[PDB]
Amino acid sequence: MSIFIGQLIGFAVIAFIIVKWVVPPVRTLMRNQQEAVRAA
Amino acid sequence: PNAIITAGALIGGGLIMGGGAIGAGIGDGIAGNALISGIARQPEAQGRLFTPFFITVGLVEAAYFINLAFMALFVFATPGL
């Protein structure tokens, strides 16, 4: 049980980090490609 | 008894991981040096250098982690016991 408690805490931490730092640039690049397709 | 063999196995696996560590660290550094230097010479080259970079970093790591796959084999699965 205990290692699961720590695991879920850690998974929340990693999801937090990706959501805050990694997701914005990824989605912005995806949106840039999306709009560049929107040109045609 | 088996204890002698196991002490030897820990020592051997330690040599494996230590050499792999030296190799992988120094190699990843030598590669990152060329990468940083190219990006300093051409700030726009970043999108281009990732290809030759990870070709290197992998072929470098292709030692360390391989050693690691054998390290466990010595420590956790002692041959010839």
Binding site: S2 | F54, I55, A72
Partner: protein
């Protein structure tokens, strides 16, 4: 282990399903279109750079399936199933099947190109005849290098996630978080490495 891989096959298959549903060449692409297209076009620019799409086009599907397969495997390894899931590459069987299939495919394509009587000797003599006996080890190294690497790294995680579990939970959350954070990156990089070295081995196998 087979179930740990079946989950990844079904996710990738459902993604191909979603693409077959969504694709639009006129309109604005959804996420899945952009991901598929970026992977395909990266590998296509790579193969175009060395062999040319017209001489060895059959490598693109293999490369992309390898990349998605191992990438999804490693990323799924991150999800907090710790307490059944363990990365499949942790088992030699998976990495062996993958690397061995890549080996047999590109070597059989070289044979198909030059012929069964022609490709072995040309591969042995290789780039410089003075290296003829080394090329064999350079040849025999090609498959093994692919396997024990993809194993060695992902296995290195499978143990570590367990070893960290040795901690108490409050200490545990920090090393597990850092490790998985950088394990996403390391798995992605090893997938790119596997696919790119597969492409390069195909290329030099043709010439």
């Amino acid at each position: 282990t087979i179930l740990a891989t079946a989950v990844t096959a079904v996710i990738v298959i459902a993604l191909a399903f979603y693409l077959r549903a969504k694709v639009t060449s006129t309109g604005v692409p959804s996420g899945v279109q952009l991901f598929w297209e970026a992977l395909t076009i990266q590998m296509r620019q790579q193969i175009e750079g060395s062999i040319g799409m017209k001489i060895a086009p059959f490598v693109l599907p293999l490369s992309v399936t390898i990349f998605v397969f191992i990438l999804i495997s490693n990323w799924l390894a991150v999800l907090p199933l710790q307490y059944l899931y363990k990365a499949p590459a942790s088992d030699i069987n998976f990495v062996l099947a993958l690397a061995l299939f890549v080996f047999v495919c590109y070597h059989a394509a070289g044979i198909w190109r030059r012929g069964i009587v022609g490709h072995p000797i040309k591969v042995v003599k290789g780039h410089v005849a003075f290296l003829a006996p080394i090329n064999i080890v350079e040849e025999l190294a090609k498959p093994i290098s692919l396997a024990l690497r993809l194993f060695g790294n992902i296995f290195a995680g499978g143990i570590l996630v367990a070893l960290i579990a040795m901690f108490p939970w409050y200490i545990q959350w920090f090393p597990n978080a850092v490790w998985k954070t950088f394990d996403l990156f390391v798995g992605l990089i090893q997938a790119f490495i596997f696919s790119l070295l597969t492409i390069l081995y195909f290329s030099q196998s043709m010439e």
